[PDB]
Amino acid sequence: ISMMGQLLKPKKTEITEKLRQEVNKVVAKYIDQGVAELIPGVLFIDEVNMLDIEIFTYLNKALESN
Amino acid sequence: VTRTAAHTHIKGLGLDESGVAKRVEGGFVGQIEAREACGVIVDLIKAKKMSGRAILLAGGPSTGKTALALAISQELGPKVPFCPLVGSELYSVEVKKTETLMENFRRAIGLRIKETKEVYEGEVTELTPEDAKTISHVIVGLKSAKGTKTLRLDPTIYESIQREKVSIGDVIYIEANTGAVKRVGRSDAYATEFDLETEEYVPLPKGEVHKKKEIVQDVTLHDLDVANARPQGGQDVISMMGQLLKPKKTEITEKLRQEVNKVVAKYIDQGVAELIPGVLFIDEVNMLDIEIFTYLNKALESNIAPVVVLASNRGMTTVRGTEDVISPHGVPPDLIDRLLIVRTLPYDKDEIRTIIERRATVERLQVESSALDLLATMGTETSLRYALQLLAPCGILAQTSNRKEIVVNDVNEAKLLFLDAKRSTKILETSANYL
Amino acid sequence: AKKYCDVTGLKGFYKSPTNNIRYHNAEIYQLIVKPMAPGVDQEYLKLRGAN
Amino acid sequence: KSLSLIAAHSHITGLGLDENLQPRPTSEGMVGQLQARRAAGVILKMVQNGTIAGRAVLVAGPPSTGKTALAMGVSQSLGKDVPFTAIAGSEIFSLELSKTEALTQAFRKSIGIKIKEETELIEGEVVEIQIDRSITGGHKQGKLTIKTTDMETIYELGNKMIDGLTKEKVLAGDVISIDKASGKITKLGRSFARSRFVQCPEGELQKRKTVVHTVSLHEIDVINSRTQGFLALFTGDTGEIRSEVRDQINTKVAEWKEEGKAEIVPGVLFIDEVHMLDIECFSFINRALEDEFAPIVMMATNRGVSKTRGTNYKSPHGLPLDLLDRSIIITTKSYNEQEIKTILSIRAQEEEVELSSDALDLLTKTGVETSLRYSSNLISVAQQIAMKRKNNTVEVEDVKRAYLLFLDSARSVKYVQENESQYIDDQGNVQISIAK
Amino acid sequence: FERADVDSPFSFTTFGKTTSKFTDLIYSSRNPIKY
Numbered sequence A: 001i002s003m004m005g006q007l008l009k010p011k012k013t014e015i016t017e018k019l020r021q022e023v024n025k026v027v028a029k030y031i032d033q034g035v036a037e038l039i040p041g042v043l044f045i046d047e048v049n050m051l052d053i054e055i056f057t058y059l060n061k062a063l064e065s066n
Numbered sequence B: 001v002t003r004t005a006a007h008t009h010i011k012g013l014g015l016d017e018s019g020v021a022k023r024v025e026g027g028f029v030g031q032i033e034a035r036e037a038c039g040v041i042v043d044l045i046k047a048k049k050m051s052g053r054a055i056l057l058a059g060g061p062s063t064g065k066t067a068l069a070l071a072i073s074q075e076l077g078p079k080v081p082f083c084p085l086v087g088s089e090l091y092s093v094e095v096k097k098t099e100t101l102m103e104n105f106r107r108a109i110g111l112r113i114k115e116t117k118e119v120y121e122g123e124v125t126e127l128t129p130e131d132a133k134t135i136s137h138v139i140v141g142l143k144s145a146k147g148t149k150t151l152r153l154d155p156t157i158y159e160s161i162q163r164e165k166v167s168i169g170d171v172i173y174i175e176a177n178t179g180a181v182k183r184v185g186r187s188d189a190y191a192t193e194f195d196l197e198t199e200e201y202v203p204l205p206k207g208e209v210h211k212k213k214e215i216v217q218d219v220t221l222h223d224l225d226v227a228n229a230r231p232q233g234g235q236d237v238i239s240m241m242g243q244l245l246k247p248k249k250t251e252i253t254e255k256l257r258q259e260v261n262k263v264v265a266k267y268i269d270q271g272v273a274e275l276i277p278g279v280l281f282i283d284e285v286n287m288l289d290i291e292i293f294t295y296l297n298k299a300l301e302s303n304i305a306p307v308v309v310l311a312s313n314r315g316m317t318t319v320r321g322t323e324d325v326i327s328p329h330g331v332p333p334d335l336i337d338r339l340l341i342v343r344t345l346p347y348d349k350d351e352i353r354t355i356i357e358r359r360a361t362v363e364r365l366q367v368e369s370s371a372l373d374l375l376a377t378m379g380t381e382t383s384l385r386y387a388l389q390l391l392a393p394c395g396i397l398a399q400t401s402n403r404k405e406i407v408v409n410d411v412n413e414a415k416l417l418f419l420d421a422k423r424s425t426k427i428l429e430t431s432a433n434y435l
Numbered sequence C: 001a002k003k004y005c006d007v008t009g010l011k012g013f014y015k016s017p018t019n020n021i022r023y024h025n026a027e028i029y030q031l032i033v034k035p036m037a038p039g040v041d042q043e044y045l046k047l048r049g050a051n
Numbered sequence D: 001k002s003l004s005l006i007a008a009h010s011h012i013t014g015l016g017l018d019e020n021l022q023p024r025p026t027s028e029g030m031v032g033q034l035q036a037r038r039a040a041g042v043i044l045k046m047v048q049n050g051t052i053a054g055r056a057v058l059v060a061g062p063p064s065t066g067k068t069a070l071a072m073g074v075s076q077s078l079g080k081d082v083p084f085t086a087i088a089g090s091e092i093f094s095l096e097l098s099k100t101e102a103l104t105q106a107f108r109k110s111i112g113i114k115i116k117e118e119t120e121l122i123e124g125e126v127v128e129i130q131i132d133r134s135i136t137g138g139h140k141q142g143k144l145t146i147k148t149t150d151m152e153t154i155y156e157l158g159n160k161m162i163d164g165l166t167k168e169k170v171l172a173g174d175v176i177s178i179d180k181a182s183g184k185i186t187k188l189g190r191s192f193a194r195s196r197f198v199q200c201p202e203g204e205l206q207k208r209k210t211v212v213h214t215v216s217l218h219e220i221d222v223i224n225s226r227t228q229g230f231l232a233l234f235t236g237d238t239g240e241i242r243s244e245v246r247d248q249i250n251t252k253v254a255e256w257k258e259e260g261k262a263e264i265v266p267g268v269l270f271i272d273e274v275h276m277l278d279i280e281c282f283s284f285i286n287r288a289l290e291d292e293f294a295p296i297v298m299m300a301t302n303r304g305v306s307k308t309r310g311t312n313y314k315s316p317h318g319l320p321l322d323l324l325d326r327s328i329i330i331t332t333k334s335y336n337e338q339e340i341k342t343i344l345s346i347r348a349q350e351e352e353v354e355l356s357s358d359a360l361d362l363l364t365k366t367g368v369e370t371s372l373r374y375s376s377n378l379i380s381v382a383q384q385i386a387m388k389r390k391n392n393t394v395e396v397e398d399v400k401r402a403y404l405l406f407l408d409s410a411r412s413v414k415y416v417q418e419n420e421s422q423y424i425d426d427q428g429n430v431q432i433s434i435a436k
Numbered sequence E: 001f002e003r004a005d006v007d008s009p010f011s012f013t014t015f016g017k018t019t020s021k022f023t024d025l026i027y028s029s030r031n032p033i034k035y
Ligand SMILES: Nc1ncnc2c1ncn2[C@@H]1O[C@H](COP(=O)(O)OP(=O)(O)O)[C@@H](O)[C@H]1O
Pocket: B006, B007, B027, B028, B029, B030, B031, B060, B061, B062, B063, B064, B065, B066, B067, B068, B313, B355
């Protein structure tokens, strides 16, 4: 499967939240082991008026995560 | 214990042997004429002769249409196929809506197959292949707690045996008709050959080696259409990881359906199969486009179409996908010319009280008779569904104060805590900033 | 052949590495097998002929 | 576990209620809204009883009045092992899934199956491994000495255990855990031998451990459908799962429930900003609530008599009357000055910010003047101004500096309206030059 | 001061590592995420 993953054409997919929770758990374990350091950053969205109401409504939820 | 969700006090139409509805029977209160018409439709479905007959039951909201459809499904039994559907489920992004409509049409035609299951299981005591590089056959001797049995096998099953890495002393599982081979594990008699081992150890089967059973397989025509039209190809019996290429739905041609019909018609004439037509139920039929309404006219004139049951709660409403077409119940008149319409009437006070008492009995709640008339007055003033949905907060608030009987103070408290649509709308109008 | 605990006669899961006596669980090992007198291990192994 | 910096609802640890379902004035990070908290406690007991299914609860109120915080308190008070799916309204408009299919997948992620099974493990500290091999490697003889703090043993090793031990290379002094049936060996680390670091196990070597699994119905639907494997639970391209597999899963779950091999747990599906859904989604929800395998749905909205999406008429809360007939409505209210002051005090203690009393009074005044969230946001940027001049406690002039620097909505609207020639209007007309 | 080293992707694997006439090496990389 890992060999055939390099030969197929890549495509964006809807990554489920379960994978994100598992990645968060593994990263939290790495931080607790003392080998990792978390560096939050800045996301810059220029020309914000091109967004529509659906992205704004999802952004309302997404700003309230941790 | 038991989960009750908006239904399951309905067990049938409550008719007698002559088709006359009793007033309180089968969990149904009132609604004599619609129940009698649904009984006539149930008899017509059990006749199993006609194709493409359609009825539609129309009325107000919260009046008993979906309850009548589920009562029909309970009256027919579990061997008759019944496909529930909502009108918004036909809009898929993988195939056209007409293909989805034909798929749901062919999902409601069933089949019954008489089959025989034959199983050998037990510990392997002898594995001697014989040739004439090509093995002619292989002799396997099984063993259980009631004795042994020696079997001959063709090399095709032997290839599956060496697929499973089966040695002397393993407990296996062989199906005679299909040739399926499953390895359960090593026997417990060989558990002390090593102190630490990778193999798992299971005891001997206490039953006989040879077991026989008669089973009845229920399939639909859509399952055969899916199984004959896999685009990438076949699949193995065990596949924990999926295919590398994602197979999506495809527009299945008419030729495949004709060939499937030919094969099934050949199998019926030998007495192997039995054809059971069923019911396709579509709720909220006003959410259909004009194109699906047009294709329904063609699909209802086929030779294999089942009985279609539609529901709608609209009045004189514009059809979706059009601009200036006004027709009753949101259904276009060329389709309306093809069905029979069953009217469903609303309720007065005492039937609302009796339904509330029935739902209190089903949910295992004890209500005082003083609170029941107040609940009926609340139901007539606002909604039947609002009175029905207020029983469980009343029960929880009664159980909180160590009481097993509903007191009217709990009904007043549940009225104060939870509002209906009208009081919330009155809050909306008399407010300043977005409620 | 099946393996049995030398002290109780139950199913012997383990075996001590010092005197090669099979035992059943931890309490038998702590109370009997480990603080055992010398020479009794050979008499225990005399029963199954492993001395 | 569960890494997190600081959330906007991180101070809420649950509903503040006693044994008689009465709300405390301030408990578990929740202040005010006593009727809403009592109603949410009733809904929590509805979920915890688990004897009824498919009930819709609508939470409606003005914006920034405890709507999402109530759902966070319910989810924190629910505890682990009970499912809780929190989606937004606009998340179901997919490109490879239909809206009804996305709603079905959101519905079937909130019902769990409890399965209890027991396994056997061997966990201890490796003392000595002795491996004897031939020239060609046809046969291998092995001895492994392993121990706990209470027993010592030596095992005669088979071939497959030897191959499973040279793979995932173990040495003396390691602490390992061995499953006999599957052959999986996990290195838990090294013991306390200086000569990561894990204390040596105690008790018996061969323990019988029982684990309780909780599997959602959607996972069984994905696994039983043979088109894709279990990896579709992570990649997300399930792609329009059919209905016959769902019927088979429902019948098999109902069959397992009678024999006691499994238990049904129901959960809560929370749909924030429910007014963004289309009319067809509402029509699907109208029939999805009348099933035995349906969770309790909580919806939140702040619209008042808005236009329903996909139609051309206005409806209360942006929802049609068929969905409003099936629901019970919890209404939230606005806050007084004392509730705002207490909420600002709790948010100050959460962010480890020391506030003077006069700064708290100024923040309460500018909270009841403009908004609660503006005064909540001003604290963390006033603390940086406090730290810039090398001071710990936030004073009055730091809050005044933060009020001067960062604008609110009402001042920005006025500043736009006085200088409308400098901004682009609805007609795309702007003036960039200063003169003329 | 510091020496430039190999440019490799970050291995998101758990495998058989040594906590120190031939040596045996077997492919043993697994995923940290377990279902
Ligand atoms: N004759 C009846 N006896 C008992 N319960 C009824 C009767 N008619 C309707 N109900 C109940 O009232 C509710 C009406 O729901 P439903 O029929 O789905 O509404 P609609 O007709 O708008 O689809 C159902 O929960 C059903 O159990």
